[PDB]
């Protein structure tokens, strides 16, 4: 997970990501297949 790569699969900065809920984040992680 390169910063443009995370930006690229989450459509979202890692900062952005760290402001959704943690239900949120492993939601989007298990979506992109991101264990």
């Given at each position: 997970?390169?910063?443009?790569?995370?930006?690229?699969?989450?459509?979202?900065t890692?900062?952005?990501?760290?402001?959704?809920?943690?239900?949120?984040?492993?939601?989007?992680?298990?979506?992109?297949?991101?264990?």
């Amino acid at each position: 997970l390169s910063d443009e790569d995370f930006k690229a699969v989450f459509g979202l900065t890692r900062s952005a990501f760290a402001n959704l809920p943690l239900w949120k984040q492993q939601n989007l992680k298990a979506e992109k297949g991101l264990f």
